[PDB]
Design an enzyme around this catalytic site. Structure first.
Site, PDB file in Angstrom:
ATOM      1  N   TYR A   1      32.828  21.023  -8.022  1.00  0.00           N
ATOM      2  CA  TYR A   1      33.542  20.210  -7.044  1.00  0.00           C
ATOM      3  C   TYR A   1      33.001  18.777  -7.058  1.00  0.00           C
ATOM      4  CZ  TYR A   1      35.610  19.093  -2.438  1.00  0.00           C
ATOM      5  OH  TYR A   1      36.304  18.562  -1.375  1.00  0.00           O
TER       6      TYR A   1
ATOM      7  N   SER B   1      35.454  12.790  -1.709  1.00  0.00           N
ATOM      8  CA  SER B   1      34.537  13.527  -0.851  1.00  0.00           C
ATOM      9  C   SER B   1      33.226  12.760  -0.770  1.00  0.00           C
ATOM     10  CB  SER B   1      34.288  14.896  -1.499  1.00  0.00           C
ATOM     11  OG  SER B   1      33.138  15.552  -0.995  1.00  0.00           O
TER      12      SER B   1
END
Lengths: 239, 239
Positions: free
Chosen positions: B144, B129
């Site tokens: 995350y 990401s």
């Protein structure tokens, strides 16, 4: 052919492999180098003889436009280097390396961009190195290291500026590749051994293996990929 | 089909697009998710219903091997998250995110590697990401962010360990993509505007655009590309 591409340093080593990969993709390719005729004839590309250490870069781009009927892709793979430590290196030598690797990268891209923008699609591929992230290990190459690292900044800057013009700009960073440019390095155990010991795959790359990724970065696969360095090094940097 | 691939989180968002891209390459694909049947039928893949937040990962790999007749490619695209700041987040929630994104990545790869090694060719693709490199900006996603950054270390470690076994391991880091997973983010100006203003291309990616690069990293193009993160983010990180 579809996309029109200009590859500098396209008659030998990595540049030649990239030119061949682009021709394989159906691109109309122009190869620029001091003596590009043999490569152009063998690969089925347009030869553009030039000395990029002296000739005006925008002039080469103009010739490419005239020869190809447009311009969508620019790959600056020209090579050169003065392998001397900083204390020995002269300012002239420093400038020779920085000019060809960095200044010419800027000048070529600057000249090519308007044509890519007009077409609404473009790919600029600069060529980096593991020295974009390290200092070359056992080899004294400060000027080269500086230039190849500088290219990452130029890559980000141009990617940002031209994103809305349909142009993607990236930096392909090959690891240790079997080429004539690296011929002197491989022929010396004290240097080859320590370097190779750090390549997890345990072998140097074939030019064609590097070109596979260059082709991706010069194609539709890179539509949403811009402003990045992509290292193809057999695991060297990760080691 | 040629290469045998297992894609977790393959029935929606990025995972589904990757599964579709692999099928397009002629791969025999197995899609794993809680309810993969519709996607498998539509895409022409093998469905492997599973709850990766609870089911033993090596058990899923065994099922994939039985269903495909081998295993060459592993893509771990399963998604989940608890969007809460560190001071609010419970250890259970922290573990839920880290387990699915990181621990399961390790367990799946560990189980798949021997089969890839036996075949003499393998591709492991973890999904990162922009938070592999930043903290998510206006969004409170510490767990995350930690997990997606951890994956870069795992990527380097496994790439190093399995390089001589014919396996390449990389981390595809998508930017902001139009998917249901990101649906809540896009439906809020105060968050969407500031983020999009930092994407040079001025738009979020379509899942298929991300999948183009995933396919490359799951193919021969990545033969000499291993232990690396490849960001496909429209210029976001470069901005």
């Amino acid at each position: 052919m579809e996309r029109k591409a200009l590859v500098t340093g396209g008659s030998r080593g990595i540049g030649r492999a990239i030119a061949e990969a682009l021709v394989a993709r159906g691109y109309r390719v122009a190869i620029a180098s001091r003596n590009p005729e043999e490569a152009a004839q063998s690969l089925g590309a347009v030869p553009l003889p030039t000395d990029l250490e002296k000739d005006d870069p925008k002039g080469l781009v103009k010739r490419a436009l005239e020869a190809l009927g447009g311009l969508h892709v620019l790959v600056h793979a020209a090579a050169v280097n003065v392998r001397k430590p900083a204390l020995e290196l002269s300012y002239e030598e420093w400038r020779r390396v920085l000019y060809l690797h960095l200044d010419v990268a800027f000048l070529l891209a600057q000249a090519a961009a308007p044509h890519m923008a007009e077409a609404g699609w473009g790919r600029v591929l600069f060529i980096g190195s593991v020295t974009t992230f390290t200092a070359g290990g056992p080899v004294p190459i400060p000027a080269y290291t500086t230039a190849k690292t500088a290219l990452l900044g130029l890559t980000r800057a141009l990617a940002k500026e031209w994103a809305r013009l349909g142009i993607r700009v990236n930096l392909l960073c090959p690891g240790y590749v079997e080429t004539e440019f690296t011929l002197p390095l491989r022929q010396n155990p004290e240097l080859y051994e320590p370097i190779t010991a750090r390549i997890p795959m345990g072998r140097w790359a074939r030019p064609e293996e590097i070109a596979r990724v260059a082709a991706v970065l010069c194609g539709d696969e890179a539509e949403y990929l811009t402003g990045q360095a992509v290292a193809v090094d057999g695991g060297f940097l990760a080691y």
